Amino acid sequence: GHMNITDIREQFPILHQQVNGHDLVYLDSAATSQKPRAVIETLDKYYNQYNSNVHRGVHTLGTRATDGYEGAREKVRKFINAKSMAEIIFTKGTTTSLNMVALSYARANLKPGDEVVITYMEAHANIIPWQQAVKATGATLKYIPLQEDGTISLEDVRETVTSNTKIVAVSHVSNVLGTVNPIKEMAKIAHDNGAVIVVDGAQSTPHMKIDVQDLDCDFFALSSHKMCGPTGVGVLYGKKALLENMEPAEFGGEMIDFVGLYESTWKELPWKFEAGTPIIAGAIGLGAAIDFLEEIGLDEISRHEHKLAAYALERFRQLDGVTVYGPEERAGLVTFNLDDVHPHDVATVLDAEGIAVRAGHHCAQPLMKWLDVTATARASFYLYNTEEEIDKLVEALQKTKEYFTNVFVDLEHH
Amino acid sequence: GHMNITDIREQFPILHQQVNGHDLVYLDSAATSQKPRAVIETLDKYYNQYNSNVHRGVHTLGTRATDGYEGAREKVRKFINAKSMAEIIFTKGTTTSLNMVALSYARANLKPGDEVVITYMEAHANIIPWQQAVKATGATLKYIPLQEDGTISLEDVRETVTSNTKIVAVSHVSNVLGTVNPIKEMAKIAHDNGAVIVVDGAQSTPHMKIDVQDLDCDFFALSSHKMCGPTGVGVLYGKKALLENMEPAEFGGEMIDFVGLYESTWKELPWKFEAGTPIIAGAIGLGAAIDFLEEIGLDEISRHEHKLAAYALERFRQLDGVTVYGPEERAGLVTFNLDDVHPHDVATVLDAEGIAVRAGHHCAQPLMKWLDVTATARASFYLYNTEEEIDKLVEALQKTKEYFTNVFVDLEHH
CATH class of the missing domain: 3.90.1150.10 (Aspartate Aminotransferase, domain 1)
Structure with a gap:
């Protein structure tokens, strides 16, 4: 009940x-949320009982750690109704996820004349990566005007987004105004103009159901620490077809297939985007936070x-x-x-x-x-x-x- | 005793x-280390008692969280004998720290004809970022030969490093051979040729004292999870003069000073390189791990x-x-x-x-x-x-x- x-x-x-x-x-809690005993004790059990590095399949504790980490990935997939775990990338947080889209997608898909369209209500994590991407590519940054109660009209979106727009980046929920933006309708508008839509969901994910298939967002970023989970972990969701065509933002172990002296090949998704030892305990604790919220x-x-x-x-x-x-x-x-x-x-x-x-x-x-x-x-x-x-x-x-x-x-x- | x-x-x-x-x-433990009760209970106390976002100075719990996070930064500074907390950047881990050097330093300081010099014994985290940097800049990647017991001679270093070498990247301790590389002598060799030296210290930091002033390394990267600390956190040390001239690798909140519609200015070091909500609990737990190791x-x-x-x-x-x-x-x-x-x-x-x-x-x-x-x-x-x-x-x-x-x-x- x-x-x-x-x-x-x-x-x-x-x-x-x-x-x-x-x-x-x-x-x-809009700055950061507090944690229930279920999450803290999940971290405790991890460090007390089965900490080991993941993705070796070699010894018992390592298998348990791997199962916990990838099971948390599946928990996230179910939680946001993504089609596949290949679309769920564990990151440092929303800010890093958005920067990853800005490096690996924006800077590879922006030419002079292209437009990145954001809004006046965006947090800095959803502004400055796009500033830097358009500066690096010579593209144009545009702002959707707000209305006078701090909401966004769909006509201002249709007017601002043009056939030269390649990316629309917008927050699901404003951390200042409390506005819930019409993400689904804006996604349809962006797609009609040939653009992808990047959704900053740091403030929506803790507080309302997310269905990325119904939203039809191309990218969606979220932060564990705002949703009863550990600090230092977040998620980047991206449509599998887009992630397949993006190059990694970070390079190192765990994200390789073959490494030669001068050239290397990458793992399949999602591991292509997870370089080095992952955030094992934090991701498992985020899965615990998801279990907690879903039970409520x-x-x-x-x-x-x-x-x-x-x-x-x-x-x-x-x-x-x-x-x-x-x-x-x-x-x-x-x-x-x-x-x-x-x-x-x-x-x-x-x-x-x-x-x-x-x-x-x-x-x-x-x-x-x-x-x-x-x-x-x-x-x-x-x-x-x-x-x-x-x-x-x-x-x-x-x-x-x-x-x-x-x-x-x-x-x-x- | x-x-x-x-x-x-x-x-x-x-x-x-x-x-x-x-x-x-x-x-x-070379894959990952286990944690003592001091570290786990540090995480527990953080989440049970004073979790809040940091760098606001607004309410009591927020002040306590900020004091814990920046105090952990000072613990790291003392631990590796860095001159200043401005040189201590909290990251996701060694892999991310090395990638940060590769983006923000290498790709901005490499021209055709320049050389990046690494070794055959390097882990992938200290290989692939340099591969990608030299590919992006048109520079050259060179390998110092190993000797036949798996160590490095200083003449092979002098022979490989030339006046066209801008970066020498090398592990302090090999995670495969167990070799302890002559980091101080190689740093002096690199500096004599006009290069900086980047030290992968993921496998040395847990096990031996690090003195970056005696090593005279220009960059030094380390991972918490290998040294009794939480997963998902590491450190990038860089000489303050080099970090001042490097642009951020990530953009967003917390690392800004002023944000306009199209241009932004950055915070002073170290916060220039820490975008978004930081790894608060993990960094505090890394400080606890440092206290533990130092007490032993x-x-x-x-x-x-x-x-x-x-x-x-x-x-x-x-x-x-x-x-x-x-x-x-x-x-x-x-x-x-x-x-x-x-x-x-x-x-x-x-x-x-x-x-x-x-x-x-x-x-x-x-x-x-x-x-x-x-x-x-x-x-x-x-x-x-x-x-x-x-x-x-x-x-x-x-x-x-x-x-x-x-x-x-x-x-x-x-």
């Missing part, structure tokens, strides 16, 4: 501590986050002098600012109340400029957060407004 | 199990491995029909073959006795060809191995020789 948030919170040891004498209120149910997690987001938006609208950026329909996060209070001070005060949020530009400086701000604060939610924690957040924001206005008034009287 | 191997083995839970009804005898003492570990290697070589010389490759003076490993037995079958039989070794080409196909073999077996030692385990190994090798000769004789009589 429905989620028992008490039972879920019980599985996350890190939630049960105090900060500055207050119960921890962790509202920074991603549709349940999405519904819980929709409830939290609607509650948070309503309660934020009860606060005077608070600006919220983005649309009403959104993922589980709220980026905001207090009138006449810098978000860094908001965040410092909140942490003094035990509440953890970010303040800054959230790796989206062009979006900050588009919002006509220099910095923002952001509270983000996930499957272990509650409406009570959102109450604490809005009460502490009212605290902060009153306190800074009172300090201002006391400095007037000087 | 000296190492108590019982007390050290007590700290590695994975050693205390049976395989196929025999006590585990893990002799594959790397000179003690080196002495223990010298004793194990001398013992193993002597006992192997007691076996008839067994060939050992490499020199007498060596790191803690023995690559070998049984006369008329394929090393894969040797390894299968050994695993049936609970003994774990590798069989294959050990990611060094040109070296295998130079040895006039297609495959070998390899037993490798580390701080938790004993002479009793080497006894079990040589007794089981005598088993295997007798058993295969007896099966051969029984098939004669048919």
